Paper text:
Cyclic GMP-AMP (cGAMP) synthase (cGAS) is essential for the host defense against cytosolic double-stranded (ds)DNA arising from various maladies (e.g., pathogen invasion, ionizing irradiation, and genotoxic chemicals). Here, we resolve these numerous fundamental mechanistic questions in innate immunology and present a unifying catalytic mechanism of cGAS. Finally, we reveal how mouse cGAS achieves more stringent substrate selectivity and higher catalytic efficiency than the human enzyme.
Nevertheless, the second Mg2+ was again missing, and the α-phosphate of pppIpA appeared misaligned compared to pppGpA (bottom). These observations suggest that the H-bond between the α-phosphate and the -NH2 of guanine is important for positioning the metal•intermediate complex for cyclization. C–E Comparing pppGpA-bound QN-mcGAScat•dsDNA vs. WT-mcGAScat•dsDNA bound to pppGpI (C), pppIpA (D), and pppGpG (E).
Numbering used by the authors:
A (entry chain C): 149 to 239, 246 to 252, 256 to 352, 359 to 506
B (entry chain A): 149 to 238, 245 to 352, 359 to 506
The structure:
Amino acid sequence: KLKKVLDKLRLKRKDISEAAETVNKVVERLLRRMQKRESEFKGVEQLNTGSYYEHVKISAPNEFDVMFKLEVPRIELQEYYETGAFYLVKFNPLSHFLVLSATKMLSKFRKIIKEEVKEIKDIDVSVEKEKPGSPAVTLLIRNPEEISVDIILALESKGSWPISTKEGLPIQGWLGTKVRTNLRREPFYLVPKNAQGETWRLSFSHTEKYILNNHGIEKTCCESSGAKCCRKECLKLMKYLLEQLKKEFQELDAFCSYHVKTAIFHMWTQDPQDSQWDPRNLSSCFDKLLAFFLECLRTEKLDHYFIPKFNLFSQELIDRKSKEFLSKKIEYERNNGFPIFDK
Amino acid sequence: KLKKVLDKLRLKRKDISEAAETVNKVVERLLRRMQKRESEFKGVEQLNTGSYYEHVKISAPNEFDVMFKLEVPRIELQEYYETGAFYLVKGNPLSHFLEGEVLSATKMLSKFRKIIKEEVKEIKDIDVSVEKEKPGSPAVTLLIRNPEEISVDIILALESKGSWPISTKEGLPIQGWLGTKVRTNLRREPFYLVPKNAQGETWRLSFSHTEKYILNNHGIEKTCCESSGAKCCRKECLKLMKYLLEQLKKEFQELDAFCSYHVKTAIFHMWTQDPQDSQWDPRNLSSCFDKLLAFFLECLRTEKLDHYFIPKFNLFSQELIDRKSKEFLSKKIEYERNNGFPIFDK
DNA sequence: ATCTGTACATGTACAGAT
DNA sequence: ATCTGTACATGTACAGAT
DNA sequence: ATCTGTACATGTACAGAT
DNA sequence: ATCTGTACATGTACAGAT
Ligand SMILES: Nc1ncnc2c1ncn2[C@@H]1O[C@H](COP(=O)(O)O[C@@H]2[C@H](O)[C@@H](COP(=O)(O)OP(=O)(O)OP(=O)(O)O)O[C@H]2n2cnc3c(=O)[nH]cnc32)[C@@H](O)[C@H]1O
Ligand SMILES: Nc1ncnc2c1ncn2[C@@H]1O[C@H](COP(=O)(O)OP(=O)(O)OP(=O)(O)O)[C@@H](O)[C@H]1O
Ligand SMILES: [Mg+2]
Ligand SMILES: [Mg+2]
Ligand SMILES: [Zn+2]
Ligand SMILES: [Zn+2]
């Protein structure tokens, strides 16, 4: 049943092969351009992020997320109000972008990508119209199949993480205190998402990647000499329910996969043992994930896993009407064996 | 009962504090002297190894082990007669130690030793001499009188960043215990060659750095022994075994062939045999220690104790230790085992 | 003026002491 | 139970060198 | 600085065994 | 139906060469 949905959602080895080679062709060429041209983004290094690289992509290999991280010689951050996740960057190449303005830096970035994309004759690839706010430059590829690639510009800072994350990332009873201390020794990132035009947002896409691939309390969880768990299959099922519901109801435009990602990070923290995620219990795991997500909706409360004061379900960001709509549609599919999965 | 031996074995913070103060002064001075003039060992880097940095040093903080490791490219190893553990290494500053292509180990260790002895001669804050050279030892031992006697093994080590030698391919069998990602990463760490002998140009593989990692990341659960996880008795068992051997080794010179590396190796195998943290519950410390003794006894009797990292190397082979010596320790361990461990009260 | 090997500065797991 | 010294990892400053 | 080579993780695909 | 074993595929860390 739920197994059979997971069979349907599984990407195909050939589809992975074909899509990956076209995306890699494009992304390498853009990344060359930022380097072997004396631009403000020389030094930018590639970091792959998102569900395709976390092995939780469903249905088709048709969406890829790539960070072009750029190391910045220190530091000065100022928190935008007390939102937790938005910051003004203050303090050379980047002199053309002044306070370091996200909009002006993104526009140059965007302008380089668009130029280099006009110079692609090998692949059918366009630049999607800019979505205000959003930190991404989105490529639309078409080797028959439609594939979209998000090129995310990011700042890399090696200093300690901002104070708003001090109580974040609570993996101590799950992944433990050494894993946490080491993760927090990694750099943190800032992306040019706005709010207004000078604000950057914290990104922890590199930390979420590690956690998805290091998700057990036992070191052998999901390894060739360990037990398989069903944590990723539960994420996929929950991502699938929201994709089907969003595709049908335009009332759900304000929800996104990151809401599902954040909720299941919390669930994993509350149920740390690998046995609470035994494959033979895929049903009650998916069901307890649903119950948790409904508790989040009912209480209009879903805190950023790394930034606890930042409520992703705050009234300011999603209306109570949108949440009660989602809770009714979800409770429905739940109590009727998920008809939506058969579409 | 066994909880009380461990209390006796526990180090005292005051002793730790005074001992580490002097040791760090001396070591830092030797390391800085290695970085000066036209010194061949310039670039050498420091790596603290051994039981003190693993937190399984027992009774007193009176024996420290430090590698002075030196990176070298080129590599070109040649295994010494299928033994698994011993190798030949084939304006370069190490030029003075070549014997045509081949890096002589005793030549390097002499020049290393001459430098340490000179630096100890100029030390006047601390009472420290250099111990007479021991055959079959890559160390330059310092004896410090801190009033208290404290020895320091300065181990000279070559560092190589290439893949580990073929003889370790089937070694380090942690896949069911610490798992395969940890194994892959560990084997991406460099490996080390110390000048232990066999003749003056043979080096021995060293994995002190890997053993130090394993000692401090020893559980199947990532939270083993952490402040939000369960305590285990894996290190408490190793301590008790170190102590049984130490007590016995200082009464019976029938046991000079045996060393604490033997008990360290047997227990890496026990930790592989019994991966789960539940097989090392603190409340089953008697039975845990007991199975470890059973295991060590079988190794003595079958004379077989494979190097944890180099499987074809048998530390209990007949060419290394007599049947005589192994049977003598089998009786003495069996005796302690079945009479309440009277040696613990000495 | 800039560069850099060295050593300070920061943070925290570990485990002994209270 | 909390307090606390040592070890160790990684970031950063700077006297002396270029 | 840039790039290739190497190893093995995480996947998919499928047949023979259970 | 599920487990095991082998082939097949891409992603990623980093040593060594240039
Ligand atoms: N912080 C970020 N780090 C890296 N990439 C980011 C980040 N924030 C945004 N992006 C990328 O920009 C596009 C638009 O961003 P929005 O913030 O406007 O909306 C996000 C998006 O609509 C959705 C999920 O996107 P994603 O592709 O990352 O999903 P996935 O995990 O790879 O799985 P699937 O593709 O299979 O669904 O969630 C929104 N969102 C809100 N906050 C965050 C966040 O903190 N991190 C990531 N996404 C967030 C996006 O397409 C995104 O790629
Ligand atoms: N025979 C050996 N073969 C391989 N490695 C060895 C051998 N003897 C010692 N070593 C390595 O050198 C380290 C130091 O050895 P040493 O004899 O000081 O033991 P230890 O583990 O430090 O314990 P203790 O000092 O309490 O006896 C060991 O931890 C091990 O990594
Ligand atoms: Mg995505
Ligand atoms: Mg020692
Ligand atoms: Zn798992
Ligand atoms: Zn433990």
